[PDB]
């Protein structure tokens, strides 16, 4: 046996995705446009995150570090300064609804 976490990763996954959508004021999940945060960090960023726990991908953190996040899944918050730039993402995304 050599792999590591599994569910947590997924769990934290939806977490972010969700928060994202919620950030825009949606009731669904929206692929976290990390890029937007990577290209425009001085506009988009997640807050509430735990100490020594950045808003990086969940497909890297540890088993504990993963929980550390979830633990504060209510404290975590997404700050969107330029939501008009997110529409593209929300538009790009297809999900279970090809429109």
Q: Which domain holds residue 51?
A: 1-99
DSSP H helical ranges for 31-80 = 34-39, 63-71
Contacts of 65 (CB under 8 A, 6+ apart): 53
Helix or strand (DSSP H, E) at 13: helix 7-24
Task: Report residue 27 as tokens.
Answer: 């009731």
Please state, in angstroms and rounded to a whole number, the distance separating the CA atoms of residues 34 and 4. 23
Please state, in angstroms and rounded to a whole number, the distance separating the CA atoms of residues 24 and 5. 30
Q: How was this structure determined?
A: NMR
8 half-sphere exposure, CB direction, 13 A CA radius: 18
* Residue whose token pair is 């497909």: 59
As for how many domains the chain has, the answer is 1
DSSP code for 46: E
Q: In 3D, which of 30, 4, 22, 16 has the Cα closest to residue 70?
A: 16
Task: Report residue 93 as tokens.
Answer: 């995304």
**Residue 20 belongs to a domain with what CATH number?**
3.90.1460.10
Helix or strand (DSSP H, E) at 78: strand 77-80
């Amino acid at each position: 046996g050599s792999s590591g976490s599994s569910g947590l990763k997924q769990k934290v996954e939806n977490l972010f995705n969700e928060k994202c959508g919620e950030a825009l004021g949606l009731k669904q999940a929206v692929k976290v446009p990390f890029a937007l945060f990577e290209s425009f960090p001085e506009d988009f960023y997640v807050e509430g995150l735990p100490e020594g726990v950045p808003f990086r991908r969940p497909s890297t953190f540890g088993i504990p570090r993963l929980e550390k996040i979830l633990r504060n899944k209510a404290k975590i918050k997404f700050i969107i300064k330029k939501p008009e730039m997110f529409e593209t993402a929300i538009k790009e995304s297809s999900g279970p609804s090809s429109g």
